[PDB]
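Could someone model calcium ion with this protein?
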Amino acid sequence: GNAPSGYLMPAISANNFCGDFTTMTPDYGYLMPEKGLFLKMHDIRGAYGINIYTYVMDGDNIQCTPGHFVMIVPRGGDKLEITIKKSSMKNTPSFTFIPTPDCENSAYVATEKVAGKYYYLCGDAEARYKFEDLFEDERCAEFKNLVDNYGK
Ligand SMILES: [Ca+2]
Ligand SMILES: [Ca+2]
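Reply:
Sure, complex below.
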């Protein structure tokens, strides 16, 4: 009913690509219908930057509005630094994700470019596993609690 879903998020210059999406370096997405949140994660040398968007549906389209940004930075001795910032509406992109009816290898594509490219949402189990492992990591309570308590 409200099970969350994970996505790989390659960025491609064309908005109508259908082929092998794994030739591109992906970000990761996580849709949480139980909370009305969409998370987008970017990896920089093992540190994670996660945007928490709020979303609503517009028919089949997922409309995503910036919320907060969580940074998770590994440090010596298996420590993590977790920090949270409010995202700016002016400086963090919004997304509208629309279906890809003609491509079975993607679930959605963005309506607008970011840095010249379209992000796709490609359904993916491993992306889901990555988020769910991070939520439940004993060191990540600050992140889990932000998400669990969000808007509430
Ligand atoms: Ca599709
Ligand atoms: Ca097939």
